[PDB]
C-alpha cells in the first residue's frame, strides 16, 4: 500500500464474554537468514552419533516458522487465573493470524563496524501448509514460541525435519521436501499477511479435580447385597478348609463390588527430592522406563497420565513421568534441582494409579492342597473395559495442541504431554528471507506478528457448600512480585500453574 | 462403510517427529551422582535436544505388541531343537490353546536383519514397512521399573513382553 | 464486573488443602454447623 503506511496495529488484549474467551497477542520478531539460503543434509554423523538411540537423518532448511503453541503466548497470568478458578472446561475454537509491518534490512560491514539500512525492494516469503504435506514439528514442544511477556522481541526458529534413517545413512524411502516448491506470498515493506483457521471439534480440557475417589463412590451408610469370600479356613490346624461369605458393607469398603476401575499404568521409577534417600549409583538412563522402536530405545516421557506420588509423599516424583520446566535464566546442561520446576500430578490420584506403584496384583497359579495361592505385581496394564482416567493437566507454560499422527488406528489421541489432540492442527507457518544476490547481500527482516484465539468455556453449576481451592498470589512482602519484571527488566514465571482447582463429583 | 486401506509407507518414524534443529523447553534427569565413591547423590537436569533425542518428551507412542519368537532363514543360526509348537506364542480359549496367527500388526524384523522372521506373525511376506509406528514382533515393547529404588536397593527394570492398548498409541494395520 | 488490566495474578479467597479433622464451613460429628473464620469481601484490586 505504501512505504510510509503501517499495515497493521498492535492488538493485545483478552475479552471475557459469557461462555467464551477471545485472547489476542501481538509480538515483535526478527528473521535471520539460515544456512546461507541453503538446504543442507544433516545427520548424527555431523553431530558425531555416539549412540544408535540418538541416530538421525534429516534436512535443515533456510526457512523459519512461527510457534504460538504454548499457553503463555495468549494468556496473561491474571487471565489464566481468571480461567482456571471459574471454569470446569475450555477448548480452542477459532484462530486468526496476522503478519504485518514488514521491515527487511541489509547489513553492510566495513572494517570493524557494521552498518544497517533499509532495503525497500526486498521481499519476505510466507506460506502456511494447510494440506499438511510437510513434516509437522509443532507438537514436539520446542523453543521459539512467542514470548509470555508482550514487550519481548523474539527470534524465529529455523525449520528442520527428520526422515527415515539407517544409522546416519538414509534409505530409499526417505523423503526430501523443497519448501520453494510450494506457492507462497511475497511481502515487501507495505504488504501484510493474514489467514483464519477453524479448530476441529475436540473435548473440553478438564480443568477440575475430582472431590471423590474411584473406590469411594459408595453410599457409606448402606450394605451391598453382594457377598465376598471372608474365610478360607476355620482356624489354625490341619484340614481346616471352609467357605465363609460376609456381605460387603461400610466396615469393609475394600472388598465391595465396583463398576469401574482406574486407568492404565506403565510404571516409572521414583526419585526422592532429598537425595540421600536415593541410591548411590547412576540410574537416570539405566533405571528408566523406555519403549523400543526398530531397535532404538526411547525414554517413556512423560508417559501415560498417572499420579506423581501417593498421598503423604510429596518429595517423590516419577523419573520421567512428570513435566519438568526451567526457571528463568537456567543453564542448558546439568543444572541443580533448585533451577528446575518439577510439575505435580497429584490432582489425578482419585482416578489414576500412582506412576511409581504397581497397578495391582494378579494370581500367578492355581491353588490346591499342595500349592499356595501366589500373586505377582502388575508393573504395566493396558486398557481394560471399564477403565476411566484423567488426561494430563495443561499448564501456563505448557503446550496447547499436537498433531494426531496419520495412521490406520489410535486410541484416545489426546497427546501425552497434555493439551488437545487434533488430526488437522493449526497449520505450520513458514517464512524466509528472499535471497538478494550480490554470494548474497547479508540480510534480515523484522516484523509484527499477531495471533487471536477464541476459547469456549464450561461453567460450573456446582452445589458444593464449602468454599473451593483457588489459585491465589500469596500476600507477603517480597523483593519482587510474581509474574513481573525484576530491577534489570527480566520477566520471569516463578511457578508452573496447573489448571485444576475447582472440584467435581466423580 | 469402511476406512480406506493404507497403501503407503511412512517416511518418518514415530520417535523422529521432532525438529532436529531446536531444543525442547522440557528437562530430564541427566545425572544421579556427582562422582565415583560413597555418599554421592545429586539430581542434575538437562535440556532435551538434538544431541540426545532418546530422552525428549513425545506426545505419542508406538502401538501394542505381543512378542513372536524369532526364527532365522539360515538354518544354522536357529536352535537345534523342535520349537515350532513349544516356543510359539499362543492364546488359550476354554482349555484349547490356539497359536497366535498372524497376531497384532508388528514389524517383521529390525532394520538390517532381513533373515529373521516372527515364528507365527508372518502370513514369507515382510511387514518391515510398518516399523515407523509399530514395535518389532520379536522385540520387547520396552522396559518398566520393577521396584522402588533406595539407598539400600538399586533401581531394577524388567522387560515388557506384551503391552495392551495405552492412550496415546498409534499403529498401522497389516498390509494387503 | 472487574475489568482490571493487572498483569500478575490477584489474591483470592481459598480453602487450604491440608489433612484436618473437620471440613471448614461444614458440620462436625455431632451435626453442629460452624463458620471457622470471618470472611471479608475485599480480595481483587483496583487503582487509586
Amino acid at each position, epitope marked *: 500500500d505504501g512505504v510510509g503506511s503501517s499495515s497493521g496495529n498492535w492488538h493485545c488484549d483478552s475479552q471475557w464474554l459469557g461462555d467464551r474467551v477471545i485472547t489476542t497477542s501481538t509480538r515483535t520478531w526478527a528473521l535471520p537468514t539460515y544456512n546461507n539460503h541453503l538446504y543442507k543434509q544433516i545427520s548424527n554423523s555431523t553431530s558425531g552419533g555416539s549412540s544408535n538411540d540418538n541416530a538421525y537423518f534429516g534436512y535443515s532448511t533456510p526457512w523459519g516458522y512461527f510457534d504460538f503453541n504454548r499457553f503463555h503466548c495468549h494468556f496473561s497470568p491474571r487471565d489464566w487465573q481468571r480461567l482456571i478458578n471459574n471454569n470446569w472446561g475450555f477448548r480452542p475454537k477459532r484462530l486468526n493470524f496476522k503478519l504485518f509491518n514488514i521491515q527487511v534490512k541489509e547489513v553492510t560491514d566495513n572494517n570493524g563496524v557494521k552498518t544497517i539500512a533499509n532495503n525497500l525492494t526486498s521481499t519476505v516469503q510466507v506460506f502456511t501448509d494447510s494440506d499438511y504435506q510437510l513434516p509437522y514439528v509443532l507438537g514436539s514442544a520446542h523453543e521459539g514460541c512467542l514470548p509470555p511477556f508482550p514487550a519481548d522481541v523474539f527470534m524465529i526458529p529455523q525449520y528442520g525435519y527428520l526422515t527415515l534413517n539407517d544409522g546416519s545413512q538414509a534409505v530409499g524411502r526417505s523423503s526430501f521436501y523443497c519448501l520453494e516448491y510450494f506457492p507462497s506470498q511475497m511481502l515487501r515493506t507495505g504488504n501484510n499477511f493474514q489467514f483464519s483457521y477453524e479448530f476441529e471439534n475436540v473435548p473440553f480440557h478438564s480443568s477440575y479435580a475430582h472431590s471423590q475417589s474411584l473406590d469411594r463412590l459408595m453410599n457409606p451408610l448402606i450394605d451391598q447385597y453382594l457377598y465376598y469370600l471372608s474365610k478360607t479356613i476355620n482356624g489354625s490346624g490341619q484340614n481346616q478348609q471352609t467357605l465363609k461369605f460376609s456381605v460387603a458393607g461400610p466396615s469393609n469398603m475394600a472388598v465391595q463390588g465396583r463398576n469401574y476401575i482406574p486407568g492404565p499404568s506403565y510404571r516409572q521409577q521414583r526419585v526422592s*527430592t532429598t537425595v540421600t534417600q536415593n541410591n548411590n549409583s547412576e540410574f537416570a538412563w539405566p533405571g528408566a522406563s523406555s519403549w523400543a522402536l526398530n531397535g532404538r530405545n526411547s525414554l517413556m516421557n512423560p508417559g501415560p497420565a498417572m499420579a506423581s506420588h501417593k498421598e503423604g509423599e510429596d518429595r517423590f516424583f516419577p523419573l520421567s513421568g512428570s513435566l519438568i520446566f526451567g526457571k528463568q535464566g537456567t543453564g542448558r546442561d546439568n543444572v541443580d534441582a533448585d533451577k528446575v520446576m518439577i510439575t505435580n500430578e497429584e490432582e489425578i490420584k482419585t482416578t489414576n494409579p500412582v506412576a511409581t506403584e504397581s497397578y495391582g496384583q494378579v494370581a500367578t497359579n492355581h491353588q490346591s492342597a499342595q500349592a499356595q495361592a501366589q500373586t505377582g505385581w502388575v508393573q504395566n496394564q493396558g486398557i481394560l473395559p471399564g477403565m476411566v482416567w484423567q488426561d494430563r493437566d495443561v499448564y501456563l507454560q505448557g503446550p496447547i495442541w499436537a498433531k494426531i499422527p496419520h495412521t490406520d488406528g489410535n486410541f484416545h489421541p489426546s497427546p501425552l504431554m497434555g493439551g488437545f489432540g487434533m488430526k488437522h492442527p493449526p497449520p505450520q507457518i513458514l517464512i524466509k528471507n528472499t535471497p538478494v544476490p550480490a554470494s548474497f547481500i547479508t540480510q534480515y527482516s523484522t516484523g509484527q506478528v499477531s495471533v487471536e484465539i477464541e476459547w469456549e468455556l464450561q461453567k460450573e453449576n456446582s452445589k458444593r457448600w464449602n468454599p473451593e481451592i483457588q489459585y491465589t498470589s500469596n500476600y507477603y512482602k517480597s523483593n519482587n512480585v510474581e509474574f513481573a519484571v525484576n530491577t534489570e527488566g527480566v520477566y520471569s514465571e516463578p511457578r508452573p500453574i496447573g489448571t485444576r482447582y475447582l472440584t467435581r463429583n466423580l | 462403510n469402511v476406512p480406506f486401506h493404507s497403501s503407503y509407507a511412512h517416511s518418518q518414524s514415530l520417535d523422529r517427529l521432532m525438529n532436529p534443529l531446536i531444543d525442547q523447553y522440557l528437562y530430564y534427569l541427566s545425572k544421579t551422582i556427582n562422582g565415583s565413591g560413597q555418599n554421592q547423590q545429586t539430581l542434575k537436569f538437562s535440556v532435551a535436544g538434538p544431541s540426545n533425542m532418546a530422552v525428549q518428551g513425545r506426545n505419542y507412542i508406538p502401538g501394542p505388541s505381543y512378542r513372536q519368537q524369532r526364527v532365522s532363514t539360515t538354518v544354522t543360526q536357529n536352535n537345534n531343537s523342535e520349537f515350532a509348537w513349544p516356543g510359539a506364542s499362543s492364546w488359550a480359549l476354554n482349555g484349547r490353546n490356539s497359536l497366535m496367527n498372524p497376531g497384532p500388526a508388528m514389524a517383521s524384523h529390525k532394520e538390517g536383519e532381513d533373515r529373521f522372521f516372527p515364528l507365527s506373525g508372518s502370513l514369507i511376506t515382510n511387514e518391515e514397512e510398518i516399523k515407523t509406528t509399530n514395535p518389532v514382533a520379536t522385540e520387547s515393547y520396552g522396559q518398566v521399573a520393577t521396584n522402588h529404588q533406595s539407598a539400600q536397593a538399586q533401581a531394577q527394570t524388567g522387560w515388557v513382553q506384551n503391552q495392551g492398548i495405552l492412550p496415546g498409541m498409534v499403529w498401522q494395520d497389516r498390509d494387503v | 464486573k472487574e475489568n482490571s488490566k493487572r498483569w500478575n495474578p490477584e489474591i483470592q479467597y481459598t480453602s487450604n488443602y491440608y489433612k484436618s479433622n473437620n471440613v471448614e464451613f461444614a458440620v462436625n460429628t455431632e451435626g453442629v454447623y460452624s463458620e471457622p473464620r470471618p470472611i471479608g469481601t475485599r480480595y481483587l484490586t483496583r487503582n487509586l
Partner: antibody, heavy 127, light 106 residues
C-alpha cells in the same frame, strides 16, 4: 511473622517434656517446620523436621526414637514431645521455619535456602 | 554425615574493617550453604542463603560466594551492629549440620 516457644522446664533425667510453638503472621500450612537446639556455650544442632501436612518427619540420630514432632494446622502450633530425657538434652530449643514456601504445583526440597524465621526459644534443663 | 569447618574460630576487628569468614564441607554441597549471625541471648538470623543470595532486610555490606566444597562470607565496612558469632550450615542433605562458628571480636 512470629514464632513463640513455650513449655520449657527443669526436669530430672528420664522425664517427659512437651514443647509448643505458637505461630502467627504467616500461613502455617505453607511451610515445613524444624526444631533446632543449642547446648549452652556450643553451636546450634538440628533436631527434627516435619512436612507441612505432617505426614513426613525427619530426626537427628541422637534424638531418634524418643522425640515426637507433631503439627496442628487448625490452631497454629508446632509440638515437640520429649521422652526419656537424658543429661545432654539441656539446650535452648528454637522453633524455625524454612524459607521456601510449599507450592503444591511443584515437587521440590524446601530446606535448600535455610530457615529464615526463628523463635526466641525455650530453655530445657535436665537434672 | 557432612561436616562443616569454619576458620578462623574467632576474629577481632575494628569498625570499617573488612572481615572474611570461611567454612568448607567434607563433601560437596552444591550451592546450598546458609550463613547465620547470632547475638548472645537471641535467636540466629539468616543473612545469606544458597551461597550467594542475600536475605531481605540484611545490609548490602554482607556478601557471600563459593560453590561445591569451599564457601566464603565477606563483610566490608564493618559496623558496631556486626559483632557476634557466625554460623554456616549446609542445606544440601539431611541431617542439617552447622559449622563451629566464628565470633567477630571488637
Amino acid at each position: 511473622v512470629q514464632l513463640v516457644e513455650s513449655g520449657g522446664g527443669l526436669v530430672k533425667p528420664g522425664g517427659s517434656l512437651r514443647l509448643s510453638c505458637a505461630t502467627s503472621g504467616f500461613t502455617f500450612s505453607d511451610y515445613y517446620m524444624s526444631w533446632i537446639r543449642q547446648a549452652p556455650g556450643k553451636g546450634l544442632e538440628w533436631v527434627s523436621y516435619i512436612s507441612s501436612s505432617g505426614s513426613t518427619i525427619y530426626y537427628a540420630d541422637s534424638v531418634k526414637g524418643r522425640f515426637t514432632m507433631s503439627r496442628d494446622n487448625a490452631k497454629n502450633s508446632l509440638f515437640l514431645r520429649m521422652n526419656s530425657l537424658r543429661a545432654e538434652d539441656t539446650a535452648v530449643y528454637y522453633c524455625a521455619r524454612d524459607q521456601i514456601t510449599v507450592d503444591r504445583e511443584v515437587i521440590r526440597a524446601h530446606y535448600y535456602y535455610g530457615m529464615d524465621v526463628w523463635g526466641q526459644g525455650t530453655t530445657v534443663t535436665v537434672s | 554425615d557432612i561436616q562443616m569447618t569454619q576458620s578462623p574460630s574467632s576474629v577481632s576487628a575494628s569498625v570499617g574493617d573488612r572481615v572474611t569468614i570461611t567454612c568448607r564441607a567434607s563433601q560437596g554441597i552444591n550451592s546450598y550453604l546458609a550463613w547465620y549471625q547470632q547475638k548472645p541471648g537471641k535467636a540466629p538470623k539468616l543473612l545469606i542463603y544458597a551461597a550467594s543470595s542475600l536475605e531481605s532486610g540484611v545490609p548490602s555490606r554482607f556478601s557471600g560466594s563459593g560453590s561445591g566444597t569451599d564457601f566464603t562470607l565477606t563483610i566490608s565496612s564493618l559496623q558496631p551492629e556486626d559483632f557476634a558469632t557466625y554460623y554456616c550450615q549446609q542445606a544440601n542433605s539431611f541431617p542439617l549440620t552447622f559449622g563451629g562458628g566464628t565470633k567477630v571480636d571488637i
